[PDB]
Symmetry: C2
Subunit: 149 residues, 2 copies
Amino acid sequence: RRIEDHISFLEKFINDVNTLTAKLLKDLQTEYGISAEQSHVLNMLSIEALTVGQITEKQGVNKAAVSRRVKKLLNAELVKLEKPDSNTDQRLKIIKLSNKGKKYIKERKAIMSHIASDMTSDFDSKEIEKVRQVLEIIDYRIQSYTSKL
Amino acid sequence: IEDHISFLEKFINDVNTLTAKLLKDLQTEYGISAEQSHVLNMLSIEALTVGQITEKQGVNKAAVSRRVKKLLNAELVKLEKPDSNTDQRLKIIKLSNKGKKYIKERKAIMSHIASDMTSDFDSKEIEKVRQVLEIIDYRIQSYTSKL
C-alpha cells in the first residue's frame, strides 16, 4: 500500500526518465544510424567491455535480439571485437567501444548533463547528496539480491 | 555532480535488470514483452488517450500506437472512452479484467521484495527522498511536454 505506492511512483519515474532521454537523444541516434536500444548497448559498454552473453541476461531478454543489435553496431563500427586476455579463456569474444562509439557516448553525456544541471541549479547540493546516499543503498540491495536470483 | 547522472542511469538499469528477472515467468505466460508491461503498468496509474501515451512514452509515435493495438488484439486492454472524458482526439484506454489480473500479480511480486529491502528503513527518510524525486519527475514531465 505505502510501499506499493512508492513502487508505483518509482516505475512512473523511471519510465518518465526514459521518455525524456529518448526525445533528447533522437537526433544524435539518428546521426549515428542507430535505434534507442542499440544506443542502450553503447551505454552499457562505456561502463565496461562485455560479451553478448553478459549483456543479455543483464537486461534480461530473448538471446537473439541482443545478438542482432550487437551485429548492427559492429557494422556501424561503433563497437569492436577484442580478445584482451588475462583470464581463463573458454571460447568467447569481448565486445568494447570503438572510438566513434565513445565519441557518441560523450555527445550523449554532454546533452544529459546540461539538461540535468539546468533542472537542478536551484537545488541544495547537500540535499541531493543525501538522496543519492539512500538510492545508493537501494541500488546496493537490488544488486546483491539479483546476484542471488 | 554529473557523476550523479551516471549513478541514476546505473540505478535505473539495476532496477530494470531485477524486474526482468522477477517477471520473466509472468510475462511469458501472458504473451507479453517487457515494453508492453510498461504500457500496461502505466495504464494502471491512469486511464489514458494515445496522444497522451505517445507523449508520455514518446519515441516513434507509430511504434507505440502498435504496442497499444497489440494489447487490444490480446484484449489485455479495453477501449472505453464514453462521454465524460473524450471528444479529444483518439480514445480513453484502460486495462481490462485480464490486464488487471496481470498487474495484480506484478504488484504481488514487487511489493513483497521492495518491502523486504526497505524494512530497516525509516518511513520519514524515504518520504523526504520521494518528495525530492517528485520535484524532478514534475520537472522532467514539464520539460518533456515542450521540445
